[PDB]
Design a binder for these strands. Structure first.
Lengths: 171, 123, 62, 134
RNA sequence: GUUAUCCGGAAUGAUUGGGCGUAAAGCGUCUGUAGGUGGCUUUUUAAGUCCGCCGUCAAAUCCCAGGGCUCAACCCUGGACAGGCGGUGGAAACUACCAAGCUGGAGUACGGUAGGGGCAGAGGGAAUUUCCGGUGGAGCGGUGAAAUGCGUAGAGAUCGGAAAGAACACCAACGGCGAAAGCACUCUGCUGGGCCGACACUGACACUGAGAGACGAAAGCUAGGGGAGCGAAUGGGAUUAGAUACCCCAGUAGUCCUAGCCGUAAACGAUGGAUACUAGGCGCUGUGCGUAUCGACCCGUGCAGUGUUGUAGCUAACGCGUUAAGUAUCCC
């Protein structure tokens, strides 16, 4: 109880935050019908470092930052080899949200649906195109991209895994 | 549906984009003859007196069309010009009537969005 | 041995048929007669697929 | 011994390592021998051994791993068929795909033998794409 | 700006790209024709396939590069990838073909083996009802409580005597068999199907199956029997404001059988079939080997089938999980 949380908020230049949806989810009780706020926060620096997080609380801002503290303990790093794009195409479903990611030329800003585009514009990739096949959901969507960019391999570690010395690569 | 023989018979075909206006059946808007200019009520959640003209068309159909705007001149046996577009509140009204066109005057004293109601500029 | 299968199934159909026609209502052995007819029939299309003359001998034997 | 002798080997690979078992026993026909010959030399697997059990020469095949992890092999193998029996696929030397840029290979049946994309892209020949792994 | 028409979005007709336990959706199950797909090795032709060359697919359009109009639109010059079809020269891995072997797929021969598999014929005894006798005399039966009914013409109860039809108690088990529906008192006859072993034989004869054909609980109908119990409709009593209903008392078609027709069921595992592969634990059934005794056990096992928890994976979730709703392939 020292006060004002100035040093303790950690001013968040390192991780920039945004919501991607704040739906009010509600439960009914004996007394009636009371609601809490479920916010989904995607945290990440533009270095290649993102992760989702849900939260719910009766306040809006405590749900956002509570989802952020859930989010900033959930980070993967993005395998993004070239001039801020992707090594190869990928698809990976989670639940019932399927996400096709596809690398792009460098003259192409990120084009995807709002959750996928949110976790990629926070991922610092600049050149991708990801269609979403399946759900209208936002959480399983974004988390499906996170699973869809964990399982993604560069050329250096595939060259290391196969044992092949090196060729067949322009750069 | 295997690639072999349940599907080089046929899959099936979707029908069409089903016509959202069974009259007007050439193309977009069609001259009409007023038969009734009655007034009906919407479904249960709304409450209004919406004023529709049941109108015979030059195509061969007869159809009850909505009349937009506030004022209306439309008496018995006048000539209108109906267009498509579904008024949700009224069961059966599928069409609108263009205002400012032939024998259906523009609305009285409107100065916001006049091209939808056929009123020339003031000032 | 193939012609013992065709001939053996033929005696199978003879004895089962002279069972069934004087009996007339066993609806269980009807499947046995029809599996024997189909099984023998795929054998006859097999040996006809292989040969001419030899399958002509299988027809002329019975 | 079903309908396919290549979904035989391939489905034994997927079903082998999705249960993390690093050992395959399959039949050794000519095209299976050729696939494991063009597959051990490309770093996916470790060793292929012929032997006999009732004078029937089989292939036991040792898959790759790494060390004691949550799962001892990191890169999931992801084998896939393409030219199904009943839907044959055929490619020129144009269509022949660079799988993921090259991180996968597309083993395919040339008039020479069966090659990879390296050994059929330099030849300029084309043929029936058996399957591509990645 | 509105409207209309078309495409997109729409993976909302799906080859790229969907599904079928419960959300829309697996035929009731099975045989099988056409057709589709198909084991291994060796050899041959090259129809498919691939490579070279050649011809053509008008010009205009689209793409690239130049040029012209002050730029652009537009105009003009040259060039070409695709991709189609044909001619011709090459390759033979895969599909197909030609020929020849092969056996693990599939069968057969043989020896066993388990079974409510089916149909037919005989035989059985409880129980119920009715009738015929002996007794005895006022209720019996029924209900939430009553009542209708039956009973002095002797009911019910009890003992004996017959007759009748229908079903088969304990065994009955989360059990066995059938393709499903179904199948259990016993015995006999004819006959299907399954499982296991030895190489004993043939050598891919395989899977699925449009249309087709068969079978297909119960209720229903035609024809003839039979009719104890139960029992739609009906009739009476009760409850009830009312009761065409639940309750009760009578009770007809029906139930059973012969010969057919009908062809539907929550015909359900709410899961079409087939093959290959992917942890285990606890079971049951059938056989096989070894141990142990020399004989019944008993332990492990080889398989096939049946069940229960459950890893991986899938799933919207519940759950399914070697009998998948897993991974793949084929067919409807």
């Amino acid at each position: 109880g020292f006060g004002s949380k100035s040093k303790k908020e950690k001013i968040r230049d390192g991780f920039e935050e945004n919501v991607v949806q704040v739906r009010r989810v509600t439960k009914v009780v004996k007394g009636g019908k009371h609601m809490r706020f479920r916010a989904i926060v995607v945290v990440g620096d533009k270095k290649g470092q993102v992760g989702v997080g849900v939260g719910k609380a009766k306040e809006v801002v405590s749900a956002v930052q509570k989802a952020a503290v859930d989010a900033r303990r959930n980070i993967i790093t993005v395998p993004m080899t070239k001039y801020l794009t992707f090594p190869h195409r990928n698809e990976a479903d989670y639940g019932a949200a399927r996400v096709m990611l596809r690398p792009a030329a460098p003259g192409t800003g990120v084009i995807a649906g709002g959750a996928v585009r949110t976790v990629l514009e926070m991922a610092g990739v600049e050149n991708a195109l990801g269609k979403q096949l399946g759900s209208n959901n936002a959480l399983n969507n974004a988390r499906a991209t996170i699973v869809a960019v964990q399982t993604m391999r560069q050329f250096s570690d595939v060259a290391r895994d196969r044992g092949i010395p090196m060729e067949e690569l322009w750069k | 549906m295997p690639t072999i023989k349940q599907l080089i018979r046929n899959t099936r075909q979707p029908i069409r984009n089903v016509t959202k206006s069974p009259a007007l059946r050439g193309c977009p808007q069609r001259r009409g003859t007023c038969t009734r200019v009655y007034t009906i009520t919407p479904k249960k959640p709304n409450s209004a007196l919406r004023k529709v003209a049941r109108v015979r068309l030059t195509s061969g159909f007869e159809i009850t069309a909505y009349i937009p705007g506030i004022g209306h001149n439309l008496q018995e046996h006048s000539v209108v010009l109906v267009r498509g577009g579904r008024v949700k509140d009224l069961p059966g009204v599928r069409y609108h009537i263009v205002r400012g066109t032939l024998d259906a005057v523009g609305v009285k004293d409107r100065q916001q969005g006049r091209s939808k109601y056929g009123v020339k500029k003031p000032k | 041995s193939v012609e013992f299968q065709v001939f053996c199934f033929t005696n199978k159909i003879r004895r089962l048929t002279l069972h069934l026609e004087l009996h007339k209502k066993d609806y269980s052995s009807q499947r046995g007669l029809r599996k024997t007819l189909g099984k023998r029939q795929r054998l006859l299309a097999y040996l006809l697929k292989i040969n001419g003359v030899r399958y002509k001998e299988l027809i002329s034997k019975l | 011994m079903g309908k396919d002798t290549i979904a035989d080997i391939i489905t034994c690979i997927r079903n082998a390592d999705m249960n993390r078992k690093g050992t395959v026993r399959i039949v050794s026909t000519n095209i299976t021998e050729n696939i494991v010959k063009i597959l051990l030399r490309e770093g996916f697997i470790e060793n292929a051994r012929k032997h006999q059990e009732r004078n029937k020469y089989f292939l036991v095949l040792t898959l790759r791993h790494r060390r004691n992890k949550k799962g001892p092999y990191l890169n999931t193998f992801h084998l896939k068929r393409v030219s199904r029996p009943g839907l044959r696929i055929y490619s020129n030397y144009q269509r022949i795909p660079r799988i993921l840029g090259g991180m996968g290979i597309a083993i395919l049946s040339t008039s020479r033998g069966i090659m990879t994309d390296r050994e059929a892209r330099l030849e300029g020949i084309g043929g029936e794409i058996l399957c591509y792994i990645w």
